[PDB]
Amino acid sequence: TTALVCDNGSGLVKAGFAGDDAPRAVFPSIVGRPRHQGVMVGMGQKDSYVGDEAQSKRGILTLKYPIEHGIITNWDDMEKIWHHTFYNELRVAPEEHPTLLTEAPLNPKANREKMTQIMFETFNVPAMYVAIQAVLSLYASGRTTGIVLDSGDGVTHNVPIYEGYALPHAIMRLDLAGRDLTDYLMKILTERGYSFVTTAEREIVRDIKEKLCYVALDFENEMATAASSSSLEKSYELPDGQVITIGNERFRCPETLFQPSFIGMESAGIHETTYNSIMKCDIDIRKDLYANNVMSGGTTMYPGIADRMQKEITALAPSTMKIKIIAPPERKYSVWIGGSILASLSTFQQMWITKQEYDEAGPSIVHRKC
Amino acid sequence: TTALVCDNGSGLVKAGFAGDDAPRAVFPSIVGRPRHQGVMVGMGQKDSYVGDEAQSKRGILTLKYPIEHGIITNWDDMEKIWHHTFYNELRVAPEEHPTLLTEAPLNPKANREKMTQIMFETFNVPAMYVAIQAVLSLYASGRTTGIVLDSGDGVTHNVPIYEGYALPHAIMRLDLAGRDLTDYLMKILTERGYSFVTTAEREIVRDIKEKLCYVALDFENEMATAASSSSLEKSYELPDGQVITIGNERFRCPETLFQPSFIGMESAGIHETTYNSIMKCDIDIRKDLYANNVMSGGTTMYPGIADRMQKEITALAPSTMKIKIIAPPERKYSVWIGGSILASLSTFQQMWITKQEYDEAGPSIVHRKC
Amino acid sequence: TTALVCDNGSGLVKAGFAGDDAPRAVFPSIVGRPRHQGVMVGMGQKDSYVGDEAQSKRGILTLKYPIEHGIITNWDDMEKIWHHTFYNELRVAPEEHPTLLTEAPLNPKANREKMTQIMFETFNVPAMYVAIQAVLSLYASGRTTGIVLDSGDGVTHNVPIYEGYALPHAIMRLDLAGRDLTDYLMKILTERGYSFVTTAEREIVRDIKEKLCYVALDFENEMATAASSSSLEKSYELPDGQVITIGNERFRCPETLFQPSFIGMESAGIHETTYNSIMKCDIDIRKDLYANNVMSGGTTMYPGIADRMQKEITALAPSTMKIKIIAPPERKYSVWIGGSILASLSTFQQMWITKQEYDEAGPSIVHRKC
Amino acid sequence: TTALVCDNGSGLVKAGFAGDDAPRAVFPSIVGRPRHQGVMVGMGQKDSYVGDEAQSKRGILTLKYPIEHGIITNWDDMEKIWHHTFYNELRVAPEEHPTLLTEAPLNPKANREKMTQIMFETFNVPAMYVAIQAVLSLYASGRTTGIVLDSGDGVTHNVPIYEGYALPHAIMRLDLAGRDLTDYLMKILTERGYSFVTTAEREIVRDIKEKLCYVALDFENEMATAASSSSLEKSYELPDGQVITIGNERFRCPETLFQPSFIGMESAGIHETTYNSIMKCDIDIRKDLYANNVMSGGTTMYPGIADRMQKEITALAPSTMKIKIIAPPERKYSVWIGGSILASLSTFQQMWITKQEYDEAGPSIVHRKC
Amino acid sequence: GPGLSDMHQYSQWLASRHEANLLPMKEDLALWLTNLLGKEITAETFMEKLDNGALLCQLAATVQEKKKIPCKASAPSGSFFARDNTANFLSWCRDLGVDETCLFESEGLVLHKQPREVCLCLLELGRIAARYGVEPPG
Amino acid sequence: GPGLSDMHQYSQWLASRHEANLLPMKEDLALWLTNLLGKEITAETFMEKLDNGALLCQLAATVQEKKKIPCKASAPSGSFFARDNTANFLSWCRDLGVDETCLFESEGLVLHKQPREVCLCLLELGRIAARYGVEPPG
Ligand SMILES: Nc1ncnc2c1ncn2[C@@H]1O[C@H](COP(=O)(O)OP(=O)(O)O)[C@@H](O)[C@H]1O
Ligand SMILES: Nc1ncnc2c1ncn2[C@@H]1O[C@H](COP(=O)(O)OP(=O)(O)O)[C@@H](O)[C@H]1O
Ligand SMILES: Nc1ncnc2c1ncn2[C@@H]1O[C@H](COP(=O)(O)OP(=O)(O)O)[C@@H](O)[C@H]1O
Ligand SMILES: Nc1ncnc2c1ncn2[C@@H]1O[C@H](COP(=O)(O)OP(=O)(O)O)[C@@H](O)[C@H]1O
Ligand SMILES: [Mg+2]
Ligand SMILES: [Mg+2]
Ligand SMILES: [Mg+2]
Ligand SMILES: [Mg+2]
């Protein structure tokens, strides 16, 4: 009867039942494999670990993410993450439960085909659907008009919707998000003589950015403030009790969303890409998009990013346009709670791909229903 | 069916049956040969003496250790010591029993090959295995994480282990141990006019070391205290009934573990080699190694050595870390206790080198299996 | 007015005059201090020794390298090595001549800042510059397109340069180089029965490495050949007339460049690190980078390393690409040769840091000019 | 003196002398600027590149077109493209030569005024004229009646002409041409998992479009054939030796000309727009327009486009009408060939704007002469 | 759980108290093992009397008759014998179509570090054994 | 050129073989440089003896006599000294009021990649030098 919703993002799995207020499971989308010689017998050990279990013992493991830039790059490790999700974390038996999955726009077609195949053949799911992540953020934010900006671990995208109609020629995708910012923070922490190199040390600087990074309102004024004073410097304790002290690295990391040039890429920045997709929409739609910029995903969680985005779009857009940014406190879960809303609707129950339609058309059914 | 376990160290043979709580035989790793004319009466004229009978007759003998720094240097005398062990101390036919032997890490490869050859060709055992001494000491400790420091008569070593995985690049060896401390006590006892010169007089100084020596908590204050007062002086009776009085030599001997330059070495000392081995490990392992420093072997039996080691590592490590030294009263037998545990496990019985797979591959099988 | 050029690496100092064909001074980057009591008046004792004189007296000295991984870790000993360089080796007053220093990429910013401070405050140079050492290898190579691989004693790095433009996001660093290979050869010689422990014995094993080691074309065939025959074994005479013999230790040592796992690192190896840097470049640049892989520094001097690098990159790159490795006969000096070229160019003479613009801006002038 | 002819479209500059059968210079209408850090001194390097030199260096450059939709949007960069045209490519002083330029119809008046000003003030031409592009295509075709379809790299237009008279109210314009099809091919190649993002990667997709794309005669039967069979797939080798395979993307790209809805436009498409222009003409002119549809410009060069166009127009027009499509082999150059014809005619030599008329009337002379 | 009311309280609930339904899961298995082993189990004593692996080897020896497995029933808690007993039982699970999701490691019973995975293992074994003449948990 | 008779022949002419009239442009400059510098030049040797930049520095000095420019006349071909000599000449052209378009880059002489833009530079410099008392190319 009740469906289950798995967001299945590039960095974190969010999973739970449709109609729940929040996910029941939230864990990192990693498998880990031991990289050292085992010497003690009797220990009953696994040959690989997933999620918080892999995160917990990362000092003996190499860590791998199966998803990169929203594409499943290792299917054998993705089937372990899905199996851990249904059988440990939710205790489901998926044979009984319709499953809603989610994807970024402008993905390769083979990704949603093979994701459809594995649900019907490995997990034997009765009914299945693949939603676009940004459309779920409008269900969560309770409205039928707006331009969503979504950024996770691997993809940044934006999708304008007006009166429940999407404008697919105006959709934008940007392969700069939280993992690229983590790798750029690792690079600039070498300027202070800190070295982070192993896949387990990447998980330490991810925690440093989540705790200490913020978006400058004016970047040159913060660069002048940090050059002139220690007032902006903060300290962080490493897992072995050493302390690092960081200064302008706190805001130079997030600034890469507004200046993609910092990581070497010829791309406009997060403010220009949402203005450019508003300008690809019809002239009579634009005022309602400027009033409804909706932020979603964990890379939108930096302090000061909504005030920076409000400032930057206001300098691009016409004077007398009333531009507004909607950045709610739960926006790291708004794709999942939007899927929980959608899968519960009585008017949605005709939209599922059922197992008996997959037995007719095969994986190709996902291009005509979703 | 039952298995034999031999510690077989540089100083003492410790031997018995797997599943017993303690070694049944414990005796010095010495062969003694007469240094006077071979026509003796009452002394029981035979070509050579082993272990306890050599130690008993030492006034008429030259004494030789077959093994130095964990390396067997007389193989014919090592075959005398093993023949004495099985037939004269354990009262058993080795043809009937699997035998577990032990080694220090970073030993020459030829040592474990020739040791494997002699067990299958001279003693004709059905099976055997060669364990690392530090890993057995962690079996006796009841745990799967820790940095183990072992010090016997000939070598000191440490192995960091975490969740049953060893980090073999972080292993340290130092060829300074109990025999180097005995030879340094013979040197500094010359300052009070006591001359010990013969191999039988080295065994008297070994007994003076075991009964009177201790580790200073602060060496400069203890040196000032022994210079200021006779209260630190103590007395010992020689085998002829003469008395020696010992003062600061009583803690200057053990201090050589912390200051290797007293015997001329460039090496760092045992508090620095354990710390440098923790700092070779991955950053997420280190906190659990600091909480589990496991002491092992007869050279760790000095009064005050755990309190000194706790102080010295706490001055190297970050002040937020919780240092613990684990130093049980059984720790001169913890390698043997660990071998007795290991050779008894259900999940160990597929790990033996058997006679028929030695017949496939010769001595070289000890490198692929152990 | 002639300029000075100084390679200033870990391991070795290479120094001389701009426009010369080769360095005049080449000596080890060591300070040595006596470790024993000077019992004798006029014995020849002096407080500390530098370079060749420290290498000559090493049996009575502790030896220290002030540079590790390209970072100056002891500034008092570097100031001693620069004083020796100008006044004893080059026989120059540095007050008269501008000086070009060199550095690895991704170094801490304090290292450049302290270098310019000591050159302007202690040595009082007219003007100063800090070049990236891989750009100098491309000057010596006579070309302005290519990916340079540099490896000395402390660090290895690669920089892709397209037409005098660097791609700084594609730059890689690996803190595995010649000293890590020396320390791994010391560890591996213990299997064969040889113990090397002191800082002076590290210099013996470093000479064994430079004379006897080579890179295998296929490692598993050389391991099988070495197991099958004595044909690959070689002998080396120690300073006291003892004889080392080694076999597979000759190629297991430099194989740790191609698989860092042998020394415990979770890192890709030098062929994968070159390929990954080419794949971070723009698609139109890549063909000219595959045709121009340039070797540099003393750790690239092993027999067979260019043939191995050609083989390994050809298995990663597409089959229609023409892979070439440029490995000059003089590549042990190409950083210094490139500095001698660059400091001589008429177009370079307005991009020194002068004493006047250092007195305006302070030592942080080095972050804006260099 | 001999006149010179510049076609000067939004994608390619075509230029040469009047009375020649073909252009002497043909190069991309791009300017390029470095996007990377210059590190090697000595290059004499330019800060900006133009034409085939910018196409050659494109991996280190950001590329910009100073014309979009037939409008010059960057005048500073258009003066560089004209200066490169006269002084490098035609190799001639413009003070000696009357110059014929071209335009699309329904352009803003300011474009031809500023273009008129720059020719008389920056280049000091003796005389100047601006022709409409499609009337030149009819001179190249050798006829005085016909409806011309011109499509290039940003504008599609048609003008009906009868007995040398245009019908200005029947002229149509679509801002869908060439560049829009390259952008749509970039969008659509993401379905295969290929990702093209930089301005340099758009020049790769533009080369893929020119040699693999074609027009389907019946789009639903090609969609059925490509879904059922691999026989429509082709391969392309990228500049780094990777191979991409494409299938229905070959004919889905050009179909956008017949279905503008694919790129989000409300516009009618190429066949309907041509039929609607004929139906705006007088009833007794229409027969000779149906017999004389003349195709022009590089976006008409797809295989199968003339056969599709004849089939689509025949389904709109009355069954008694004889529809013919004239599509020359040389139609990539029809506007330039027609300008070379026109500027050469003896009856045209009174129609030039001369420098004396510009010095009297100013830039607005271009609205009454042209 | 706490829901969306504030995001700090939700992250504190993900980190610990996440699986507060473990106490209900122990109560079913304690009564089932009390019927099946003939040894009295309560949800408070459940880990404290399973942790030497011996009763789980007796569970396998009870369920199998409806490999032979070795065991030291005398093994003390926190020992390598308690680990070795538990490793024989986890091998009997791996021979029975259970996988590295629902399995615990032998340390995870013996040091009490993985009590959820002990319940998930016992439930998965119960659902497979139900096909072969065993009445499963309530 | 080939004309539009075969449409494929013309698009090769634009790229593979666009200046067959390069040799006529070298011939005039070789005899003019031989008159002006006294060093003997031919259209076959032209690139091979200009490519170290040294005779173009002598040209700049000669045309100035009729900034002081630094030069290393001993520089070997394909070197960074040949680039550095040529970069001084190209800077002297920009100080002679020549725009960025008719000039070459220093690599374009030293590696022979841009012999058209070398001839365009020498002709443009010649037309400027005519206003300051040096007789230009034929
Ligand atoms: N406070 C934070 N500050 C910055 N980045 C964060 C923060 N919290 C989480 N993130 C980023 O958000 C990502 C979560 O989104 P992800 O699972 O990849 O996609 P999605 O939003 O579709 O579910 C994390 O992996 C991390 O990179
Ligand atoms: N109580 C003690 N105090 C100090 N040293 C001791 C003590 N007991 C034994 N030793 C020394 O420890 C060494 C023996 O340790 P052991 O672990 O048995 O060595 P091994 O394994 O090589 O046989 C000898 O040097 C001995 O003198
Ligand atoms: N023939 C060689 N084979 C291997 N390593 C070499 C050889 N010659 C020099 N090296 C190594 O080069 C390093 C010298 O230090 P450094 O200045 O950084 O390198 P470089 O020689 O490039 O100047 C040392 O590790 C040294 O052993
Ligand atoms: N073979 C081809 N197939 C498809 N498109 C082409 C082809 N050859 C050229 N093009 C397109 O035609 C354009 C023609 O040039 P353009 O500057 O727009 O002038 P014009 O409109 O007068 O032809 C090119 O820039 C390119 O976009
Ligand atoms: Mg998501
Ligand atoms: Mg012993
Ligand atoms: Mg060097
Ligand atoms: Mg046109």
Numbering used by the authors:
A (entry chain L), B (entry chain K), C (entry chain H), D (entry chain J): 5 to 374
E (entry chain A), F (entry chain B): 13 to 78, 95 to 166
Task: Pull text from the paper.
The spectraplakin family protein GAS2 was originally identified as a growth arrest-specific protein, and recent studies have revealed its involvement in multiple cellular processes. Its dual interaction with actin filaments and microtubules highlights its essential role in cytoskeletal organization, such as cell division, apoptosis, and possibly tumorigenesis. The GAS2 family cross-links F-actin and MTs, which is essential for the regulation of axon morphology, cell apoptosis, and cell division. Notably, the GAS2 protein is the most diminutive spectraplakin, comprising a single type 3 CH domain and a GAR domain connected by a hinge linker (H-Linker, first panel). In summary, our research revealed that the GAS2 protein can promote MT nucleation, facilitate MT stabilization, bundle MTs or F-actin together, and crosslink F-actin bundles to MTs.
To understand how GAS2 recognizes F-actin through its CH3 domain at the molecular level, we utilized cryo-EM single-particle analysis. We used GAS2-CH3 (residues 1–201, Fig. 1A fifth panel), the minimum construct that can bind to F-actin, and obtained a high-quality density map with a local resolution gradient better than 3.0 Å, as judged by the FSC curve. The GAS2-CH3 domain in orange interacts with two adjacent actin monomers, thus following the actin helical pattern. At ABD1 (amino acids 13–31), the N-terminal loops or helixes of the GAS2-CH3 domain mainly interact with actin (n) by hydrophobic or electrostatic environment (J and EV2B). At ABD2’, the n + 2 position of actin Y143, I345, L349, and n position of actin M44 at the D-loop form a hydrophobic pocket that enfolds F108 and F109 of the GAS2-CH3 domain (E and EV2B). ABD2 had electrostatic interactions with the n position of actin between actin H87 and GAS2 T129, actin K61 and GAS2 E133, actin E93 and GAS2 R144 (F–H and EV2B). The longer N-terminal of the GAS2-CH3 domain forms a ‘hook’ structure to catch to the actin. We also found the GAS2-CH3 domain is far away from the actin D-loop because of the rigid 310 α-helix; this way would result in the weaker binding ability for GAS2-CH3 domain with actin. Our high-resolution cryo-EM structure of the GAS2-CH3 domain bound to F-actin provides the first example of the single CH3 domain interacting with F-actin.
